[PDB]
């Protein structure tokens, strides 16, 4: 995962939302793809 | 160019009370400080402090609730290894609702021996108790 300041694009299967100021990313089908800050 | 003199033995103060309901911090601080130092009625000024007393009996009802109630630090140094003591406005008003306005009014006052003699007359009240039954302060607008 890592703490990150880049969100970019990395996997087309990701679902993105801005939550409590930061960008959150979760991926249903492709493995390990996740983000908790951005 | 002399035109007047002060007389600290003449009696003039008559007490007035303000309602904190609907009042903001910088408003209540500046509108009280100018009336406590005196810049609106009988100005001499800068020489002595010319206010007639102006007080608050219920300090908590200030309108600081939509923005910057989650703000400030009110830092205090005790001189021990515990460091500087921090409190947010929402903590500071909750323990002693007089202090956030007594700090702000003092932040709207001059400093040194006369600026201290203004603050000695600030006389903000605490405890939600009727103690003005003969003082009889009339209610003043800001």
């Amino acid at each position: 995962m890592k703490v990150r300041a880049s969100v970019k694009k990395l996997c087309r299967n990701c679902k993105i939302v801005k939550r409590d100021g930061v960008i959150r990313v979760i991926c249903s089908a492709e493995p390990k793809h996740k983000q908790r800050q951005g | 160019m002399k035109t007047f003199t002060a007389k600290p033995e003449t009696v003039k103060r008559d007490w007035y009370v303000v309602d904190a309901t609907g009042k903001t911090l910088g408003r209540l601080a500046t509108e009280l400080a100018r009336r406590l130092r005196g810049k609106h009625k009988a100005e001499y000024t800068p020489h002595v402090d010319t206010g007639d007393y102006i007080i608050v009996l219920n300090a908590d009802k200030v309108a600081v609730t939509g923005n910057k109630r989650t703000d400030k630090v009110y830092y205090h140094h005790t001189g021990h290894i515990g460091g500087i003591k921090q409190a947010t406005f929402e903590e500071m008003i909750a323990r002693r609702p007089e202090r956030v306005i007594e700090i702000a009014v003092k932040g709207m006052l001059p400093k040194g021996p006369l600026g201290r003699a203004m603050f000695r007359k600030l006389k903000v009240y605490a405890g939600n108790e009727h103690n003005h039954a003969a003082q009889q302060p009339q209610v003043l607008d800001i």
Partner: protein
Amino acid sequence: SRVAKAPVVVPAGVDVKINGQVITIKGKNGELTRTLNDAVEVKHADNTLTFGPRDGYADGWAQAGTARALLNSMVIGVTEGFTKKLQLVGVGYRAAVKGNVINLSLGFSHPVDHQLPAGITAECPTQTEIVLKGADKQVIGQVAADLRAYRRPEPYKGKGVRYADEVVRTKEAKKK
């Protein structure tokens, strides 16, 4: 901003008191439901209602689309009730409910108990369903969120407290 520009209709047989302090409503599914006034004001001079900023308060126009949502739910909570979503899943874990006081058995030595707020009813109609009844959509959401404080279900077995709405699934022998 979109939704405060548009109206909502008062359903037939619903009774409102809406022209002063404390808004009161009743209907088919709820009686003496009331709320205290806030920064948004509703217009009742037609069978359709519209929202705008209440005088004597601040920034209520940015809140008018939010007031609409809480009002629509305040009608739903007296005309038909709300959607049930809380569940407890996996063998050896089950809820207990008095009507009245609710408890979860979910593998902790914590109490995992709730005395309920006023006007809230609790039911556990199956081995895995939980239901909360009332007229405030937020209280039946938040009582469920205290019941969702322990035993988070994992992507290896899926056992614990869950909603009928999820961002995680179980995956077996996954890549790697």
